[model samples]
Target: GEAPNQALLRILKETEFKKIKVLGSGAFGTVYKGLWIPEGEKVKIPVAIKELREATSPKANKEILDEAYVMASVDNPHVCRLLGICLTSTVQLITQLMPFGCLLDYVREHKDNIGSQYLLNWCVQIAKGMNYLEDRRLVHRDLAARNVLVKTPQHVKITDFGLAKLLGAEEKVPIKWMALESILHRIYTHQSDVWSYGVTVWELMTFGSKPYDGIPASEISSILEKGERLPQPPICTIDVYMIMVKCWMIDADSRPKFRELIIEFSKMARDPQRYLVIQGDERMHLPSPLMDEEDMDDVVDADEYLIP
Candidate 1:
């Protein structure tokens, strides 16, 4: 039998929110969709519940704490809102629910997926959210497609702050988005977040493609360590490329601020027609994504691991 526990499972079951369905699952945990009966409302909307497995080690707890702390502190319409948290000893951290799922899914279902207009609009919101965190000296260590959720066509919520950390004024950390000096074990800071902002642009532009699809992680890490960037696909346009280039620049200090990103992307979104001219061309069509059951054994052979 399991040891006597103070973790209340019954409270979770008795909670006011109605359990709906699962959102997604990973090695760390599974996220469920739930409905909240906010006092006396005519309608009930969806919410998300992140149920993490019990952490057996201090390292695991640290990881959980990292996400909980950062997520609790950030409140942005563009970022996922934390309604409340439930910590079940060594087991879980229940977070506020988001119904729209991740941006990855939103992009696949939309026709003008990854269009300059769409990305620019989304980028502005993301920048605003990131700027909020930066002002508090917090950096999201892991910024990617899966971590961003879309509540509406234009609204984004930056989620999963598991890798976020506070920085010392003089400390410089080796961040995935940092310059050479920072990568050389300097410390973690707001500038590191700027590096992630660049990657975020790429994520938006590619509609959630992996950073280096054709290459291995080791090679990608090596290149990043040397202040080089992974290759960009041919479909990426010049303006998009320029923004991405700026984000991945070698010097972290020289990168654009969140305020700049917000202003620039806002303009781009307004006049996206100038950047992209929709044409009836076959090249515009993306390859039909494969089904999992059809190629279960050959999954490793695929370059892009997309979720629809």
Candidate 2:
């Protein structure tokens, strides 16, 4: 059963669907759980409706369309099956329902039940999906655990393209998840996605924790420009650790492409037992001088700005 909300009820009434519930929410949208009661259908299955937060610009609309096009282009089991898309005067992007939610939710629920290898295996699957995007010269600027969904214990899919851009948008205006060089008003490339992949791997290993959670997003730009990176935890093996380090390199060219990452991550997934020994144990260990204390100050001025 799903909890009903204002947005869900609005969509349910408009679509004439019943048994509506909440799917998930983000800075820009809210996904609702729906059940389509089509005429002559034997059973009413679940559907997911992702609606944009508010009024969007033409540029934003173009981004949404680009996501649809990208999802339609790839036909891989590891990628989220884009059942269908519906755009209305009010609804920006309505997608076919995905019964299973996000990878972040699953990881949070079964944190202790799973091991480091299990996490690494998921990373391998995500790498496969990312490889597909990279081959097409696509850049998923927003690569994080929450954006990756799990259909089963062993099956995973990548979703959320609100921040994607073309490989040629190197000189475009500022973009989220841009590499250090890109953030410094420099050129960006598809390689920036690999840098984000490394950060995603860290989130997977840490059970879906936010990257640089303790630090301010504004400061990340400057820190990255100085060639600083978020520390990797023990759960990541030497090979994965090396891969993560390479992914976050300030130079986009220094990062390995998705194809190469797929080869390496696949081998590690095949023999996680061997890799785990070298990577050591997985535990919570934040580096010293972290922004843990500084973040507290933000609480008082929480309304200073909105999170993008």
Candidate 3:
């Protein structure tokens, strides 16, 4: 893990990647729900084809190339998997299509019915993935709930810029999700990543509630300068909030590492009743979490899909 991964980037022909529909288009690129029906076989494998419109600039193109290298370097179910690249009409990155899409959207969409248990399980998985990156001395500077994709109620994968590709790459300055030290020194450490992880956990606990709602982004640094942190979610248990509190410790060295957090969350996930208790008034505010599964026809048949 010391050296840059010499990933033999797989360059595939554009013919096999059948673009189904645009998942979303951004300033740089458009992600499509694609079907990788390879030559001579009707396998119909589902895939995500990201078409980059701004592939002209050398620096921009390198980001894409570097992303492929980083993705190929790691192999974990909880981390995004890059299949290959396409040099056809436009430069493209082919990846496994998570049916449920962005973790933020999934949680927000099903906020009424979805419960706490699945959220805690996702925290365990996220911690496990972060532990992998931490072990390799790879810090995910951009850590947020929005940076992850959910495949199912049980499976989630960290995606995009969060990959430990460019260590000293210039970072975007986002206030709400930043750690105290990150804002002060513009320094990114694994400890800072842990700080953002606490915010991400808060996002999940609140079922996609925005951190520091109604607060101006410009004022967040001053807010933290006053020794303030994000408020606890109404439904989130005291014990669970304590985890976030530890993550937001004033001293970076005092914060629990991802290794400790993996057990910190996994233990609670293993037995929800012990730690995740929602009292009477809080129960009314929380979504019904008692059922094994929410009664909904939300099953996504991953085999085939036509439109976004």
Candidate 4:
């Protein structure tokens, strides 16, 4: 495993890092888009801050280090890198500021404006990012569009790797994204994350359509056990759907690893026109994804979303 470089190389000076606005506030915590003024520099550097300056206990305090360790752990073009840690009055977890917001928001807004090739590349980026995580021995249990950040309209970065536990905690589970093994066996593994990645790519292809929409939670496990999978996105060809199917294999060992996914998705991304077949409604109405997903069930945090 590669040593964590950003763990010590980057340090956010509290005086210089200014929290601009709340990006998202939830049971996990608040994420903020901030700006950092370099010492004696004219231009301000953009940053994202996850404020933990007021943790209530020692366990809460350790949560900060836990995030600090993971975020600063890997450096990949598709994984969000930790900018630095700020400690003064308390603590603030800072990282690269993504101006375009999340993958869901970006795809919803730009599906018509941009080419499908970009969406193909997004999948490749995610696979490569997850492959990096696979190598680093880290599992991003929560793998979804909401947790991925868009740096440019064409480039995406994975974020919020283990936030649910470190920040607030997640017991209910995002059943919609969980693999069959994860759902029935109460198992979470790199393979399970790959299953979620299949759903995430499906979401991107459908321009943010909620997976298994209108499906109730009580029967989700049953549906998976029956080998039912999400239908193909309108814009996807058999090639794309085939890749997703490979990820959602009933047998966990049969599922393609992240490294295999990287190669599979990268080929389609390189020649997207050859693989994509838009059946109907190429530029359909952009979905309001803010109101979707099963993760934050019963709870609504319309305040803000995670920014890169």
Query: For each candidate, what is the lDDT?
Result: 0.60, 0.63, 0.74, 0.74
- The lDDT ranking, best first, is 3, 4, 2, 1
Question: Who is ahead in TM-score, 1 or 3?
Answer: 3
Q: Which pairs of residues clash in candidate 2, taking residues 3 or more apart in a chain or in different chains?
A: 47-97, 48-97
Q: How badly does each model clash, as a count of residue pairs?
A: 15, 2, 0, 2
**What's model 2's overall lDDT?**
0.63
Lowest-sum lDDT 10-residue window in model 3: 287-296
TM-score of candidate 1 to 2 decimals: 0.74
- Per-residue lDDT tens digits for candidate 2, residues 159-244, read 87665666776422323345776667655566877877888777777776766778776788877777677776656566767888
For model 1, what is the error of residue 131's alpha carbon versus the real structure, in angstroms, after optimal superposition?
0.8
Better of 2 and 4 by lDDT: 4
What TM value does model 3 have? 0.84
Query: Model 1 over residues 42-65: C-alpha lDDT tens digits?
Result: 434345677665445776776666
Tell me the TM-score of model 4: 0.80
Instruction: For residues 207-260, write the lDDT of model 4, one tens digit per residue.
Output: 888888899977999988888999987778888899899889988789898888
Q: Which is the better candidate, 3 or 4, if ranked by lDDT? A: 3
